[PDB]
Paper text:
The RSV polymerase complex is composed of the large protein (L), a multidomain protein having RNA-dependent RNA polymerase (RdRp), polyribonucleotidyl transferase (PRNTase) or capping, and methyltransferase (MTase) activities, and four phosphoproteins (P). The RdRp domain is essential for both transcription and replication of the viral RNA genome. The capping and the MTase domains contribute to the formation of capped and methylated mRNAs and have been functionally mapped to conserved regions V and VI of the L protein, respectively.
Single-particle cryo-electron microscopy (cryo-EM) analysis of RSV L + P in complex with JNJ-8003 resulted in a 3D reconstruction with a global resolution of 2.9 Å. Non-protein density was observed at the capping domain and was modeled as JNJ-8003. JNJ-8003 filled a mostly hydrophobic pocket of 397 Å3 volume. The cinnoline ring of JNJ-8003 made hydrogen-bond and π-stacking interactions with the guanidinium group of R1345. The amide group linker of JNJ-8003 intercalated with hydrogen bonds from the C = O of I1381 and NH of F1385. The fluoro-phenyl group interacted with F1385 with a T-shaped π-π stacking. The comparison of the ligand binding site from the JNJ-8003 bound and the Apo structures revealed notable side chain flips of F1385 and H1338. The side chains of F1385 and H1338 from the Apo structures produced steric clashes with the superimposed JNJ-8003 and had to reorganize to allow the observed binding mode. Our structure revealed that the van-der-Waals interaction between C1388 and the fluorobenzene group of JNJ-8003 was disrupted by substitution with glycine, reducing the potency of JNJ-8003 by more than 200-fold. Our results show that JNJ-8003 directly contacts S1266 of the priming loop with a van-der-Waals interaction, potentially reducing the mobility of the priming loop.
Author numbering:
A (entry chain B): 128 to 241
B (entry chain A): 10 to 134, 184 to 619, 627 to 659, 689 to 1461
C (entry chain C): 130 to 191
D (entry chain D): 128 to 188
E (entry chain E): 131 to 199
The structure:
């Protein structure tokens, strides 16, 4: 009698599908409505559904691109830089570092003329 | 019939809006910003502003401005000009120089007395000390920079002093001057500050607080220069005497000047650049302590942080002064990007000051206060967070589930570990099987055998109530001295009437009539005092029925004080309760809330903006668990369920919103800068403990996912995450690389997991290190602590941290603050000299210019000095003062730092220490050798003194309550009175008329209660003040007293319910006489007739100070026997030897560190923290969780009484009345809950708030690791004498003393001795055995106290609560 | 092997319960409070019930 | 056997809880004024029902 | 009847249906919303019965302790 086994396999498939949805389910936080006149509930939908709402700016979020990459479990350019092996300097910082390195009085600054 | 006493130090914030409002009105146009503030202040100016504008001098300046003769600048411009005030005449230079020389000379002459005594006592041997004669020679010519800062401080201080004096005398007074500080014309009012510089044709307008700040800046810079100077001078004489750090004051002045240049080029926003300098210093430190990968990463991030801030400052500056009257004040250096040159120079100077020396680098943290404070743009700060709080967050459900799971996991782990059981589950059925086994067996898996799947499973659990809420309100947690936001409908009352639209002004008048007096109070204390409908269960009831949800009166008010948030009392109470419940019931589960190679790293995270990232969906998933544990719903989720539904408004007085016509309802006011709705929680300071424990739960989730161990610590708004992960070290890979890769791998995971809950982290907020801890602002390297002690004393000055310029308090404050230089800075003499400088100024120079008392206090000290001159046969007044400032404040002297504090931090007996202190001090004049036994000399100055201490007219009064309140009190007017005692009557007089019956009833019976309480233990023979303290603490009067003591510490007590900031003359006069009586106390204590010429002066031959002290205390209270308080002074009883004796007969302290100097080094031994031996007691088995903290404490107190007073012949009636009165249980029932003490002698074990629980050495803990101590030799001698019975000398202090003095010797010798032997004076040590408390307790009076103050009783244990205890 | 299969089924159900319960708690947000249905979503707890019992046993003098 | 039966019984109650939560979520996810008032009013009735049951039990003696 | 486990299949179908019903709810507006809220089971009464059952279960525990007084 393998009918019980077959039934159990069907049970497993349904549980798999239910868990499939749950582990791919995204909860949007409760928040202000458009033209803020109230608060919408914490709408819940599937990963892709929430991503599309973010992509098309249906929901109000700041880091639109990051929210999408995060929900897709992808590494964004910003995250890669923030956690890079070596931190680069901003152009302003490059100049500052160049001034800081070499104490040769290259600053040539006159405070008396301020 | 009242006065207004203004601040002498910045206590609040420098409001941007205030400065803008005032300046904008004066110059008829936008000043700092073009916003509603400048618009309204011009349309409808405040009277205070009109008064300044209408001055004849102001009008002259205004004309010059409009004629284009003078230009308008932002206050930071003037900050620079003031700080660069070099326009001193020769007479000014001479006068100030001579003043400074005098002060320094006197401070040294003063320190000479203690230094002499210390060197004599140690035996290391107008100034007698050779060391200080040498120092005086070095310090007789102050550097120009010190003079510069001293002069500026002095002048600014004189400007303010004149103002404050005149304001008290004439309310509304404005100080107009141009002579005190040449070139600068000031117009000062508590409502504004106008400054004009004639030669530069420049004017600026700021506020009173900015002026205070300028003074505080000059003071801070002065103290830095002064300490630096002293330290350098001391180090010149002996490298071990001064501070570990060593700065060139020339660099320090350049830093200061360059910092001001930055603020001059970058107006207000320039503070952003200064703020980021902390990163620069941290970088310099890391460049020393960290590996190349870690330090390089930080350094580059650090530079970006600074430059990004600088660029932000430029952007914001240019956008701000676009349409304002300051549009022409932007330097071309900003526009041309030359500011980067100024910045590079500034940072180089910092690097130079640091000199690659961690000792300097840590100290340089003073640079963040040394430049003052920014003007706070309250509206901008509002908008800055709004963007993060109106933001929609997205989460994977599995993320939220796992976090809730982790939270629960920790709760279960906690319960299993603490209560030896799982929490009860209302749905245990959700658990599979393996988990049901854990549940049934009351066990749990470790994280190493846990999976993510399991956390999801645990996230499905629900609980039955495990804890209990208090039914009655604890007024201690609720009552405070802070402001309270008014109800939403009365929110407009927060703004000046003139700044409100006429419709609002009319509506305010109409709305006030619909609110109670408690609603209109605007203050927390008054809120409750005015609540005539108040009852003890209002909060409980409100919580249970969720009356705070959807509550129309809820509003969130922000003020500049990092944007302090307030809400109406109702909501405040809920906020406080939720945090309290977490603090007492939950944090117990979160203790941190307070291969061939294992990789290690640390991630340091700034969580200050984390609060903003929380949403209901991320926080309340955990708070709901706490709701269930406490059987209450919406209590711990109150924030997110309420805040989104209210308007968040900046309520700073001068920063009103624009309100459209006919709009009254705040929630219908157009969103605008500084005002918005739909704030999705995250209010800083609220639910802080909740978020802390949530962070911990997340970390556990992270450690699980990352397959590594986390040892985290969270403190306030930041955390340190220590990560450890066993790995297989790869070929060619070193440990530093493995650790760096771990940090990166873990950082990526951490960022992902935090982002996974809606919290985005930034490289500006989070950084990594290998193995060094820089948390809590303490720099520790290789176990060595590198303090920032200067930062702690920057604000030391005349009337510091005192109310109504209370003289004795400010002395204590100076003492306490300057003590840090000794305790952290590890420089006894530097702290002493620095202290004496400011104490001198406070007593000798500023005392005659008191804001309230004029020179009355000064005239009184002169009487004291004349008195001392005669009493001690001194040569002059200067000498009398030299002595005065070295005498214990306990005796009416001027010394806030008893000598014992230089060796150990805590004593159970202040009197004995004060007596010894005086003996040591007087030896200076009597030439008594402190290395020997006290003996009668031809100089009777000491014998006269001691005679006067012991011989006096007895005058006991309410001795038992006095001892209960203060077990070390003396009575008979033999001690200085304090505000808590002096004002208590005034407080009760006010409270007795309060609308709130709870307070008025208590106050009305206060006197009778005190009397009944006094006559309670009066029949017990061997009076034990600490035992009395327990009795007192166990009674409801204790809580009543705490409220009184809270109130008694404020200003204008009699006007509390008068709704005014004015200070009543009654309070001024009482405080005046209080101070005067305390100043002249020394006269009353030491009469010229020695309290009787027929009383032979006390002979010191075979005199025991311990016994003398006991005698004095007993005489002063007219008691036959006082026990458990008197304790020998270790500093007196130990004779210090630096050799090997024939017989040890003492404590041997050895130096284990091989080096001749131990300062700045860690040794092989364990750190000494004193550590009093705990109580040895058997704990009864019951469900403690069934009880609240308050009633558990009550039980513990009663158990202590059962222990201590077991011997009273009325024990059963005594304990029965207490148990029934305070718990409701009979004694026999209560006894089953009482811990059973197995310790026979409570005299050195009983834990009370009046007794030190630790007796640490006056030294950094890291420094004690260089020493080893052996108390055996002495233990044998004592055992042979006392027969294994206890003695009254504190064991821990004996050790702590030795450890500290070994450091002190190093300081004075530049050589740390290999060993020190402490040989005790046995005649000073007495048997301390537990007494038999014969006599009965007055049960009638006991009942009377409990009844009269019944409203302050804790929750009683009901039968339904009691039965649950034993299930 | 039937019990073994049931145990895997039971574990998945437990995981499902975990996810759904967290979802319920997160779902019962500020808006559920606004409409007065948060208690319905989360459930009544002891103190609210004790208040109910108190009222029930004291509607008048009883 | 009994071990199988016991497991099946536990599954049934888990499924009941799952449906209970989903009913809560599906019902709550519908937020017109009528549905929300219906829930709130039902809770008022719920309170009243608990009161009447409690009162009844209190009158057994 | 071991095959009674078919009842699990039946319930899981309802469970998946309800889960779908829940998530598709967010798709209502602008797409699947012709009126305000489309047809759904809407059995708040089941939610209420679960609340009643749980609330009374809790009430039973409270009484169980009161019973000891
Ligand atoms: C925690 O609070 C307190 C502690 C102690 C205290 O520690 N007393 C010493 C003790 O009784 C002992 C016994 C023996 C006996 C005679 C029993 O052998 C000793 F030898 C030594 C001892 C001495 C110095 C030394 F260097 C080595 C040993 N100490 C102690 F037990 F508590 F430690 C005294 C207090 C007095 C008051 C008034 N208030 N609080 C106190």
């Amino acid at each position: 009698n393998d009918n019980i086994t077959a039934r159990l396999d069907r049970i497993d498939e349904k549980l798999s599908e239910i868990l499939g949805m749950l582990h791919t389910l995204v909860v949007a936080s409760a928040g202000p409505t458009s033209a803020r006149d109230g608060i919408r509930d914490a709408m819940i939908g599937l990963r892709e559904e929430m991503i599309e709402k973010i992509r098309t700016e249906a929901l109000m979020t700041n880091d639109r691109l990051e929210a999408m990459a995060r929900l897709r479990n992808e590494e964004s350019e910003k995250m890669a830089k923030d956690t890079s092996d070596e931190v680069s300097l901003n152009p302003t910082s490059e100049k500052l570092n160049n001034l800081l390195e070499g104490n040769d009085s290259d600053n040539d600054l006159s405070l008396e003329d301020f | 019939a009242n006065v207004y006493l203004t601040d002498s130090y910045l206590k609040g914030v420098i409001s941007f809006s205030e400065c803008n409002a005032l300046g904008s009105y004066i110059f008829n146009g936008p000043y700092l910003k073009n916003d509603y503030t400048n618009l309204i202040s011009r349309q409808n100016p405040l009277i205070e502003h009109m008064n300044l504008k209408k001055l004849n001098i102001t009008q002259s300046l205004i004309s010059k401005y409009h004629k284009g003769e003078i230009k308008l600048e932002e206050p930071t411009y003037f900050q620079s000009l003031l700080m660069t005030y070099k326009s001193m005449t020769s007479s000014e230079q001479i006068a100030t120089t001579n003043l400074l020389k005098k002060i320094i000379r006197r401070a040294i002459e003063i320190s000479d007395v203690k230094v002499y005594a210390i060197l004599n006592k140690l035996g290391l041997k107008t100034i007698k000390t050779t060391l200080l004669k040498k120092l005086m020679c070095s310090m007789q010519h102050p550097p120009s920079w010190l003079i510069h800062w001293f002069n500026l401080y002095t002048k600014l201080n004189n400007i303010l002093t004149q103002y404050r004096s005149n304001e008290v005398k004439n309310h509304g007074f404005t100080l107009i001057d141009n002579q005190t500080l040449s070139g600068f014309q000031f117009i000062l009012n508590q409502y504004g500050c106008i400054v004009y510089h004639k030669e530069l044709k420049r004017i600026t307008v700021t506020t009173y607080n900015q002026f205070l700040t300028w003074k505080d800046i000059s003071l801070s810079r002065l103290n830095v220069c002064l300490i630096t100077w002293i330290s350098n001078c001391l180090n010149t004489l002996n490298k071990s005497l001064g501070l570990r750090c060593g700065f060139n004051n020339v660099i320090l002045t350049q830093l200061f000047l360059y910092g001001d240049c930055i603020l001059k080029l970058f107006h207000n926003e320039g503070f952003y650049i200064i703020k980021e300098v902390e990163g620069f210093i941290m970088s310099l430190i890391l460049n020393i302590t960290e590996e190349d990968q870690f330090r390089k990463r930080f350094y580059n991030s650090m530079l970006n942080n600074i430059t990004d801030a600088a660029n932000k400052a430029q952007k914001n500056l240019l956008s701000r002064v676009c349409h304002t009257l300051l549009d022409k004040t932007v330097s071309d250096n900003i526009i041309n990007g030359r500011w980067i040159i100024l910045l590079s120079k500034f940072l180089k100077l910092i690097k130079l000051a640091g000199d690659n020396n961690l000792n300097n680098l840590s100290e340089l943290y003073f640079l963040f206060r040394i430049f003052g404070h920014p003007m706070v743009d309250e509206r901008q700060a509002m908008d800055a967070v709004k963007i993060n709080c109106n933001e929609t967050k997205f989460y994977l459900l599995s993320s939220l589930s796992m976090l809730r799971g982790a939270f629960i996991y920790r709760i279960i782990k906690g319960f299993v570990n603490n209560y030896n059981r799982w929490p009860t589950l209302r749905n245990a059925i959700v658990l599979p099987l393996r988990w049901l086994t854990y549940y049934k067996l009351n066990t749990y898996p470790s994280l190493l055998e846990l999976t993510e799947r399991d956390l999801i499973v645990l996230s499905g659990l629900r609980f039955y109530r495990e804890f209990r809420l208090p039914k009655k309100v604890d007024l201690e947690m609720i009552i405070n001295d802070k402001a309270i936001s008014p109800p939403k409908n009365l929110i407009w009352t927060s703004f000046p009437r003139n700044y409100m639209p006429s419709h609002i002004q009319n509506y305010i008048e109409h709305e006030k009539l619909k609110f109670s007096e408690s609603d209109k109070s605007r203050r927390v204390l008054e809120y409750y005092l005015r609540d005539n409908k108040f009852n003890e269960c209002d909060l409980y009831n409100c919580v249970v029925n969720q009356s705070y949800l959807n509550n129309p009166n809820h509003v969130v008010s922000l003020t500049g004080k990092r944007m302090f948030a307030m809400q109406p009392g109702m909501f405040r109470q809920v906020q406080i309760l939720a945090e309290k419940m977490i603090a007492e019931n939950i944090l117990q589960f979160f203790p941190e809330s307070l291969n061939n190679y294992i990789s290690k790293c640390s991630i340091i995270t700034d969580l200050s903006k984390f609060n903003q990232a929380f949403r209901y969906e991320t926080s309340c998933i955990c708070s709901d668990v706490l709701d269930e544990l406490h059987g209450v719903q919406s209590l711990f989720s109150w924030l997110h369920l309420t805040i989104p539904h209210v308007t968040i408004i900046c309520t700073y007085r001068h920063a009103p919103p624009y309100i459209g016509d006919h709009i009254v309802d705040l929630n219908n006011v157009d969103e605008q800068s500084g005002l918005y709705r739909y704030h999705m929680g995250g209010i800083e300071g609220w639910c802080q403990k909740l978020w802390t424990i949530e962070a911990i739960s997340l970390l556990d989730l992270i450690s699980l996912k990352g397959k590594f161990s986390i040892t985290a610590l969270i403190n306030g708004d930041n955390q340190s995450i220590d990560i450890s992960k066993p790995i297989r070290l790869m070929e060619g890979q070193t440990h530093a690389q493995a650790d760096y890769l771990l940090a990166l791998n873990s950082l990526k995971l951490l960022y992902k997991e935090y982002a996974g809950i809606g919290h985005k982290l930034k490289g500006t907020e989070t950084y990594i290190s290998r193995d060094m801890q820089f948390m809590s602002k303490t720099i520790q390297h290789n176990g060595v602590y590198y303090p920032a002690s200067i930062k702690k004393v920057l604000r030391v000055g005349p009337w510091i941290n005192t109310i109504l310029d209370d003289f004795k308090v400010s002395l204590e404050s100076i003492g306490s603050l300057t003590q840090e230089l000794e305790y952290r800075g590890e420089s006894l003499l530097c702290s002493l000299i620095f202290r004496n400088v400011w104490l001198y100024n406070q007593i000798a120079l500023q005392l005659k210019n008191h804001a309230l008392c004029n020179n009355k206090l000064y005239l009184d000290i002169l009487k004291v000095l004349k008195h001392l001159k005669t009493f001690f046969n001194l040569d002059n007044i200067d000498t009398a003062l030299t002595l005065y400032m070295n005498l214990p404040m306990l005796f009416g002297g001027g010394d806030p730092n008893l000598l014992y504090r230089s060796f150990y931090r805590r004593t159970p007996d202040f009197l004995t220490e004060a007596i010894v202190h005086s003996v040591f001090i007087l030896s200076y004049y009597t030439n008594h050798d402190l290395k020997d036994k006290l003996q009668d000399l031809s100089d009777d100055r000491l014998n006269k003194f001691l005679t006067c201490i012991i011989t006096f007219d007895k005058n006991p009064n309410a001795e038992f309550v006095t001892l209960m309140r203060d077990p070390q009190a003396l009575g008979s007017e033999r001690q200085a009175k304090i505000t808590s005692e002096i004002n208590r009557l005034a407080v009760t007089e006010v409270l007795s008329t309060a609308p709130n019956k709870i307070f008025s009833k208590s106050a009305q019976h206060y006197t009778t209660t005190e009397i009944d309480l006094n006559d309670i233990m009066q029949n017990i023979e061997p009076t034990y003040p600490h035992g009395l303290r327990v009795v007192y603490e166990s009674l409801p009067f204790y809580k009543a007293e705490k409220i009184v003591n809270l109130i008694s510490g404020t200003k204008s007590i009699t006007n509390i319910l008068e709704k005014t900031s004015a200070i009543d003359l009654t309070d001024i006069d009482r405080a005046t006489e209080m101070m005067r009586k305390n100043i002249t106390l020394l006269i009353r204590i030491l009469p010229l007739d020695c309290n009787r010429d027929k009383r032979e002066i006390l002979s010191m031959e075979n005199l025991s100070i311990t016994e003398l002290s006991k005698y004095v205390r007993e005489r002063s209270w007219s008691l036959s026997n006082i026990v458990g308080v008197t304790s020998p002074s270790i500093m007196y009883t130990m004779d210090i030897k630096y050799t090997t004796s024939t017989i040890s007969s003492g404590i041997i302290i050895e130096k284990y560190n091989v080096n001749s100097l131990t300062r700045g080094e860690r040794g092989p031994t364990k750190p000494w923290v004193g550590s009093s031996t705990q109580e040895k007691k058997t704990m009864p088995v019951y469900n403690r969780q069934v009880l609240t903290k308050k009633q558990r404490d009550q039980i513990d107190l009663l158990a202590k009484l059962d222990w201590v007073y077991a011997s009273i012949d009325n024990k059963d009636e005594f304990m029965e009345e207490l148990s029934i009165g305070t718990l409701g249980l009979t004694y026999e029932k209560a006894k089953k809950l009482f811990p059973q003490y197995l310790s026979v002698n409570y005299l050195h074990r009983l834990t009370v708030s009046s007794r030190p629980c630790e007796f640490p050495a006056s030294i950094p803990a890291y420094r004690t690791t260089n020493y080893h101590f052996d108390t055996s030799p002495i233990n044998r001698i004592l055992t042979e004498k006392y027969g294994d019975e206890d003695i009254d000398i504190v064991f821990q202090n004996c050790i702590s003393f030795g450890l500290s003095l070994m450091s002190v010797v190093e300081q004075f010798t530049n050589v740390c001795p290999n060993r020190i032997i402490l040989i005790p004076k046995l005649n000073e040590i007495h048997l301390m055995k537990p007494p038999i408390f014969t006599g009965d307790v007055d049960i009638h009076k006991l009942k009377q106290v409990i009844q009269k103050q019944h409203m302050f009783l804790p929750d009683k244990i009901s039968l339904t609560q009691y039965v649950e205890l034993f299930l």
